[PDB]
Structures are given as C-alpha cells and as structure tokens.
Amino acid sequence: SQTVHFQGNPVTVANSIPQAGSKAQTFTLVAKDLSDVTLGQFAGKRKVLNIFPSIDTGVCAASVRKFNQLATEIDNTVVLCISADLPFAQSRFCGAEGLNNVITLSTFRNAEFLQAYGVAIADGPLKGLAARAVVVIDENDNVIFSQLVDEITTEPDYEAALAV
Template structure:
C-alpha cells in the first residue's frame, strides 16, 4: 500500500487489515504495561504518526472525547513518539486517555504499519473484538483524518448487551 503525504509518495507498507489481531504489550504514560488481550471488548486502536503534528493532535483529541463518552469501549492511542513526548503533549492539551509508545516499532511491525523510510507509524484505526479485527481503516494519505463516526459505529455495534 502506497502512503502519500500531500499527494506525494511518502512510503509503502503492507498493513494487516483483517483476521486475528496480533496480541501486543506496550507501556502507557504511567509506565504500566498494557496488553491487548487483557482489555475489555470492543477495543478501538487509534494509530498516528507524530503527536506533535496538527492532524495527529486532532485525531487524539477526538478519540479522547469519545473515550470519555463511551465507557463500554476500550480505547488505545499509539504512536512511536517517546513516552516523554506523549506525556508533555497530553499535559499541555488536557488529554487523559491511554496512550502507548511504540518507540521500538513492535506494534508497527506486527500490524505492518511501520513506515520504514519515514520511521513513523501509518495513520490508521482498528476495532477489535474477541481477538479479531472487525474494522480497519488505513489512510493512504497520511495528512487526512480517519472516519471517526464509522469506527465508533462499528465499536458501538460490537458492545455485548446483557
């Protein structure tokens, strides 16, 4: 898959879009280990290239608001910024959600989202339920925002009613 930036070829990846969601464990801003398989379903994973850019900030803020309003959904935000960069940004922006650092590109490699030339993660969103990817959006234009409403609709439809 070709990833563009402002319409120009930026990098190329082979992302995982369906099937089993590879389990991973990353560290959050409080230095706690967060493991995908230990989270309650459904799970929205918001992946962005760099927390210090405008579109990434918009994406993270949008899902932060959604996380506060949708307690039945587990939300993760992942970038390969350092935890210090993420914590500084969150403190400045008043964002309080689970943000994970993939500084070693473990998640990016598992999901095929690491942009080798740019050394960033491709902008994308996944919805996971019962260890399966039930929705994925990998943005071919890195400067575009994801379809928040679609991801939230899929996640809301996947909430178990008891």
C-alpha cells in the same frame, strides 16, 4: 505492500493492516509510566487503536478530539492512541482531555507492533514512524474494522470510532 501519501509524495507502508473478521494479533507497548502493556490486559473490552505518526504536533484539532470522544462513548471501550513518540512526549496530547478510557501507548521499543499491524512507514522523512490508521477490536479480540488513512496528515472517518 501498502502506499499512502505525505507532502505530495507517496509513502510505503510495510505489509497489510488487519482485516475485519480476523483474530487480533497480540502486542506489547509502553505506557506513560514506562511499564509494558499487552492486548490481553484489555480482555473482555472493545479496543480502538488510534494510530498516529505523532501525537505531539502542538496542535489540538477539534476533529482529533471528536474522534476519541466518539470512540469512548461506545460501551465497555478503551481507546489506545498509539505512536512512536516517547511516553514523555505523549503527555502533551490534547486530543483526549478528560477521557478516562483513553490511554497513550508508545512503540519506541516494540517496532514489531508496527510490522504486525501494517502501519510501519518504510521510507521517506517519516521512516520509523507509524502511519495514520484505526483498528477496532471487539470483546473477543476479533477485528471488526480497520482503516489506513491515504493521506498521513488527514484524519480517519468518524464512522470508524463507532464500529460496533
């Protein structure tokens, strides 16, 4: 239903990513301590969903850290860096060092999240992983911004991190 690219080859992404003005769908993901975490646990806060195919590349790009840093600077915000890496691997993420309101969440046992949010790679070598995307949700669980990055290895625009 959506198509991005990787290694010079197109990639299929199931359904469609949330649209501004829409009520955010609930979801459950796993934290670094293996506990479950839902959207409602962040009620009354601004949520920035930073979705990656993987946050365990072993590379600390300045662009990635900058985005997270910008996102957390907006009032009453929480940044959720989401991927299919297991919580174990997510600890190696170096794109949010020292940012207290940045949380890593795994999708390893909640594949429905990827379907509902329209970021599930449906084919190619990266099948089973999440596409690169950003979804911003406000204090009233309303989506005010979303972006599915055309090129998987590319980062989203910094503007996304600052959506309201």
